[PDB]
Design a binder for this molecule. Structure first.
Ligand code: HEM
Ligand code: HEM
Ligand SMILES: Cc1cc(CCNCc2ccc3ccc(N)nc3c2)ccc1C#N
Ligand SMILES: Cc1cc(CCNCc2ccc3ccc(N)nc3c2)ccc1C#N
Ligand SMILES: C[C@H](O)[C@H](O)[C@H]1CNc2nc(N)[nH]c(=O)c2N1
Ligand SMILES: C[C@H](O)[C@H](O)[C@H]1CNc2nc(N)[nH]c(=O)c2N1
Ligand SMILES: [Cl-]
Ligand SMILES: [Cl-]
Ligand SMILES: [Gd]
Ligand SMILES: [Gd]
Ligand SMILES: [Zn+2]
Lengths: 401, 402
């Protein structure tokens, strides 16, 4: 049982939860690989038992016989079909645990408050699209963002998956120029190509919302364009730097990740788009200032009349902060939900304490919990953490193509 | 071998050096403890020693030569006769440089071959330690043009106490616990402070009082020695455009000289082996002055800068912090004392990575310690995947001798 210290406070806890870690991460006693981005009925049954037992203990009915009724019910269903169906209550619970268990999520204070949309009855790409449009509409909620997940049918043998080819529901195009550069978002060059390949007539803005590439089982994907009324965006302005608006920067309201696979009691849902709301550093530091994303830092520093020929002026730092100020200011002015890295990490600290009392620990990935600016100015910097894999879980998955 | 990717560039390497790791860290396939601050006869001494000698003869490209074979046989014989052995001077020099080279948490390793090694293994008294230490400080400081150095005191040996320096660094500021529960001076140095007093030091009452040294010779209590004022170079802190900043009366010292780690070379242990480089401004700017459990000046500066400190989303914290970093860098450049900002340091570390990949097929690195405590993703190391592991020769933590 690892001993975990907070070095700001000197306080000590013990992670007993990590003893129950489902699968194995990439580390060994010889070498730590924690900085890496990517780490049969009997096998299915075993995972299924564990989930069901989990669920009943969470509702104070372990040793009950609704428990044992459910237990043997699943045993019979897989015995007869090779898979099994989750009760809707079990799907909600599994969806919340999987969020709750995601080591790299700082927003997890909210894990018990999630809206789950059951789309397991989905049959077509058009249906998929309509489910997605309802999701986007519900979660956005005119700027008062609400956490939501939509769950499409589970993978099953002898049938293709439901997949959402886009990495997010809202993505900006990344147009490759022949000079090798990218207009728009470099992150989305691959999918901007694939959208075009599947017939999308490309735009040429720095912020063209992509079409959706949705794929029903065993059929090729189909292009669907989002009703621009559904896609809430925020023009970016700065509270006191009047020229900032003219840079023409914008970003969207809804972080709706669409390419991770959801696992629940051995069952795998390859298409289960979820969304929350943004931490400002995601937009302001990573998306706008990463060298391989929009990379706007020097543009802004030049506008701020900062000396950019030496690094000890900290021109890079001063401009990143102001870009983050503009993100925060613009979202608030537009009444769109957003949280700053200080507020968010303070909340995660509270979450650690709640989880320590709730489950005797909390899997956390330090490198992702600590914000990409002002890291040590936030409390999580000083908090030792233990990283491990529980189930249910959100996992990465290979590309559908 | 671990595939390792840089996400800024897309480039990919493999760390084959990590397979040479022969001492275990805290992680398992079930749970990673990478973020923990403390990640922790004759035949294994010999396999440790043989490996080290092999390292040395490889380094001068005379592997398998008669001299290599001869030195192996010599060490084996000395171990057989005495239970230990002594490094040749040349081996010690290389050993110390290799320990620096092997430290996963040092972002300054581009410099690792430029290290001045003072050999103090003939040292016999605490008084003599002090002499060796003053000469260290003199050489390293070099009137503000800093030079990396290490002074190696005698090795651990059976039936004789260790040489120890009780202070964590050669230069430290006193931290006096106000009965308030608070602290005047530097809170990180409260225990060494009260020990200095308990051992006879007449204390001060300022925030930047330089601590005396408690030096320990074998089997003898620690002895108290005062640093000569003229030996301790300090920089007054001022801001290039914030003139009121100077009125905060802040200062730091020039020389970061860590004195409480254990140097380990080919099985031998050197409990006392102080080393020094030069500061990265974030250590002073962000950590030392803005950690809530250190000088904790962030809020006072933000108020002075007239920022809205009643709401996080104004980012008053980030703003005051950046300016404090600017002030440190400015002050040091003004005083003409070497210092490196975190942008330059990390870029040079990227260059170190590329050298090491070529030279050794890997480089042990602790991502959480290599990324600066501000502006992390603004620096290139943020996007570089890293493999953390323990090579020897090594610098190690060791228990406080009290
Ligand atoms: C409600 C407010 C939320 C906030 C403020 C928040 C914040 C964050 C942030 C900043 C990250 C780092 C992502 C990155 O750096 O790319 C993250 C990661 C993550 N989040 Fe949360 N999140 C929220 C809600 C959710 C929800 C509703 C789910 C799932 C149901 C979720 C699941 C995850 C997962 C699985 C990751 C890992 C990132 C990855 O592997 O790509 N989060 N979150
Ligand atoms: C010459 C300029 C140097 C720079 C800019 C530099 C930079 C740094 C920094 C910023 C840290 C992290 C400190 C912390 O956060 O507490 C560090 C750690 C470390 N450095 Fe360097 N360093 C330099 C020279 C040296 C030298 C000369 C040695 C030894 C010969 C050394 C050995 C180490 C070791 C062993 C650590 C691990 C820290 C620990 O575990 O407490 N460095 N270095
Ligand atoms: C390019 C890439 C990025 C990543 C992390 C992205 N994580 C996004 C994400 C996921 C979930 C989120 C939930 C809430 C939120 N505010 N942001 C959230 C952001 C992993 C792998 C690759 C690859 N290849
Ligand atoms: C309080 C604490 C702190 C630490 C990190 C200290 N790192 C110092 C250090 C070591 C070598 C350095 C080399 C150069 C430089 N500029 N700073 C350097 C700073 C570890 C354990 C504990 C404990 N307990
Ligand atoms: C190389 C490094 O592991 C990688 O860039 C990680 C580090 N921490 C991160 N943390 C968050 N929140 N998001 C990220 O994309 C990353 N990237
Ligand atoms: C808990 C956490 O690992 C701890 O505060 C570490 C993080 N990384 C660090 N990295 C450096 N360079 N210096 C530090 O003091 C720390 N502190
Ligand atoms: Cl994003
Ligand atoms: Cl220091
Ligand atoms: Gd101008
Ligand atoms: Gd001024
Ligand atoms: Zn690890």
């Amino acid at each position: 049982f690892p001993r975990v210290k907070n070095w700001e406070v000197g306080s000590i806890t013990y992670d007993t939860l990590s003893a129950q870690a489902q699968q194995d991460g990439p580390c060994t006693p010889r070498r730590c690989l924690g900085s890496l981005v990517f780490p049969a009925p009997e096998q299915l049954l075993s995972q299924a038992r564990d989930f069901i037992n989990q669920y009943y203990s969470s509702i104070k009915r372990s040793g009950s016989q609704a428990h044992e009724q459910r237990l043997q019910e699943v045993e019979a269903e897989v015995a007869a079909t090779g898979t099994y169906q989750l009760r809707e209550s079990e799907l909600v619970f599994g969806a919340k645990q999987a969020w709750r268990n995601a080591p790299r999520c700082v927003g997890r204070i909210q894990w018990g408050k999630l809206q789950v949309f059951d789309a397991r009855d989905c049959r077509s790409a058009q249906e998929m699209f309509t489910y997605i449009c309802n999701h986007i509409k519900y979660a956005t909620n005119r700027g008062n963002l609400r956490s939501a997940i939509t769950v499409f049918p589970q993978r099953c043998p002898g049938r293709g998956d439901f997949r959402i080819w886009n990495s997010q529901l809202v993505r900006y195009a990344g147009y490759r120029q022949q000079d090798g550069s990218v207009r728009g978002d470099p992150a989305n060059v691959e999918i901007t190509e694939l959208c075009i390949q599947h017939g999308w007539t490309p735009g040429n803005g720095r912020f063209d919302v992509l079409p959706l590439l949705l794929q029903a089982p065993d059929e090729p994907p189909e292009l669907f364009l989002l009703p621009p009324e559904l896609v809430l965006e925020v023009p970016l302005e700065h509270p006191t730097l009047e020229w900032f608006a003219a840079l023409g920067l914008r970003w969207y309201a809804l972080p709706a990740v669409s390419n991770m696979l959801l696992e629940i009691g051995g069952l795998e849902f390859p298409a289960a788009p979820f969304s929350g709301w943004y931490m400002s550093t995601e937009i302001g530091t990573r998306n706008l200032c990463d060298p391989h994303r929009y990379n706007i830092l020097e543009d802004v520093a030049v506008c701020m009349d900062l000396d950019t020929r030496t690094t000890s002026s900290l021109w890079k730092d001063k401009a990143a902060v102001e870009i983050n100020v503009a993100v925060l200011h613009s979202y608030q002015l537009a009444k769109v939900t957003i949280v700053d890295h200080h507020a968010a990490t303070a909340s995660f600290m509270k979450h650690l304490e709640n989880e320590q009392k709730a489950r005797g620990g909390c899997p956390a990935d330090w490198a992702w919990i600590v914000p990409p600016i002002s890291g040590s100015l936030t409390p999580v910097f000083h908090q030792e953490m233990v990283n491990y894999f529980l189930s249910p879980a959100f996992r990465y998955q290979p590309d559908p193509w």
